[PDB]
Design a protein around this ligand. Structure first.
Ligand SMILES: C[C@H](CS)C(=O)N1CCC[C@@H]1C(=O)O
Ligand SMILES: [Zn+2]
Ligand SMILES: [Zn+2]
Ligand SMILES: [Zn+2]
Length: 232
């Protein structure tokens, strides 16, 4: 029932209810001759919404806001970008123009600036050291250490037992390590271990791309990263 990359035209966004007050948002983009999906999260924050990650670009992110307005009808007041790549910050300007307060760690903001990407307005303190966790309304933000990127955050929704791994966690169907241009391959397995150790009760695990699963996604990611590391 989860929207697959084939069912979503580029420019459109789907919402998927994961649990009470938790949705993923799914968008797509073409890249290098293929089409890829990308997930973010929406978490009900009382009578407001907390958005995790843009929908990968300005056009998708405008479509995301329109779909949230139509399907949920609560204002998106804050957004957190979980790393500095365009599937996480691309569209921050659209959110900002819609009155959403945009947030990211100083590490993400610094890297987004280096990359020339959009830069969230606010800085999330307390996440600079591997293993650091901070509460942000209805979620916990956790910096597990460097993995897919040096700044990657994961997001846990304690009320729903939803672990959003972002692009540090791979869906089961992914056999390669994905875009490793900014990755710390040597630290990625240890960073995954920190996630496993902190959220062993997670019932839903949402990768940054593709289908949700369970905590099995973490061991799968470890295997995929190790296979990439061992490339010959
Ligand atoms: C823009 C994102 C950032 S994780 C990216 O690097 N990639 C490569 C894999 C999926 C997505 C893409 O461009 O297809
Ligand atoms: Zn990325
Ligand atoms: Zn990604
Ligand atoms: Zn596997």
């Amino acid at each position: 029932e989860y929207p697959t990359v084939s069912e979503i035209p580029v420019g459109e966004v789907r919402l998927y209810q994961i649990a009470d007050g938790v949705w993923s948002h799914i968008a797509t983009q073409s890249f290098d001759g293929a089409v890829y999906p990308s997930n973010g999260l929406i978490v009900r924050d009382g009578d407001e919404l907390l958005l995790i990650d843009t929908a990968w670009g300005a056009k998708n992110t405008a479509a995301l806001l329109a779909e949230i307005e139509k399907q949920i009808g609560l204002p998106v007041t804050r957004a957190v970008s979980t790393h500095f790549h365009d599937d996480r910050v691309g569209g921050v300007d659209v959110l900002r123009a819609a009155g959403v307060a945009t947030y990211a760690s100083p590490s993400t903001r610094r890297l987004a600036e280096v990359e020339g990407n959009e830069i969230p307005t606010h800085s999330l303190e307390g996440l600079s050291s591997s293993g650091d966790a901070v509460r942000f309304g209805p979620v916990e933000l956790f910096y597990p250490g460097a993995a897919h990127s040096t700044d990657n955050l994961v997001v846990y929704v304690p009320s729903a037992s939803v672990l959003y791994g972002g692009c540090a966690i791979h869906e089961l169907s992914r056999t390669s390590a994905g875009n490793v241009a900014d990755a710390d391959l040597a630290e990625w397995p240890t960073s995954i271990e920190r996630i496993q150790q902190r959220y062993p009760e997670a019932q839903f695990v949402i990768p940054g791309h593709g289908l949700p699963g369970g905590l099995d996604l973490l061991k799968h990611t470890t295997n995929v990263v190790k296979a990439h590391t061992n490339r010959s």
